């Protein structure tokens, strides 16, 4: 016979417009509703530069995934 002394198990947390201002993803910015370009970040979300400018000026985390927002500068 065998006996278990320890163990480790694994599982995944299985579960798209500009959520922060809720306008359509490709549409314009409600605050100004037309000069906001879209912004991308390392955490792979797309938000309005207006939305993000304000929000970041308030708080310094990604509002969608709880990580320090980093303006994506690859490929640029």
């Amino acid at each position: 016979r065998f006996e278990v002394k320890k163990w480790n198990a694994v599982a995944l947390w299985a579960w798209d417009n500009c959520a922060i201002c809720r306008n359509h993803i490709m549409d314009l910015c409600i605050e100004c509703q037309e000069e906001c370009t879209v912004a991308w970040g390392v955490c792979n979300h797309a938000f309005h530069f207006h939305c993000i400018s304000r929000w970041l000026k308030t708080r310094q985390v990604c509002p969608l995934d709880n990580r320090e927002w980093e303006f994506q500068k690859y490929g640029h």
Binding site: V42, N44, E70, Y74
Partner: protein
């Protein structure tokens, strides 16, 4: 390699070995040190996120213990 096109494919390949290495051994000093050297090469910062994931999981273990106590 940083800032070039090859970064994405290198990172894709690196993830695939860092996975098995973390499941075979806990996140040692070695992985964190190598990353503190070559981190800015990885464009999306996936490996750092795997490492941080292990730590978040230990925190969750603490909270689960407390929750059991409250139920009892």
């Amino acid at each position: 390699l940083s800032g070039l096109e090859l970064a994405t494919t290198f990172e894709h390949f690196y993830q695939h070995y860092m996975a098995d290495r973390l499941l075979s051994f806990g996140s040692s000093w070695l992985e964190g040190a190598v990353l503190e050297q070559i981190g800015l090469c990885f464009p999306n910062r996936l490996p750092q996120l795997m490492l941080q994931s292990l730590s978040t999981s230990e925190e969750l273990q603490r909270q689960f213990h407390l929750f059991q106590l409250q139920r009892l």
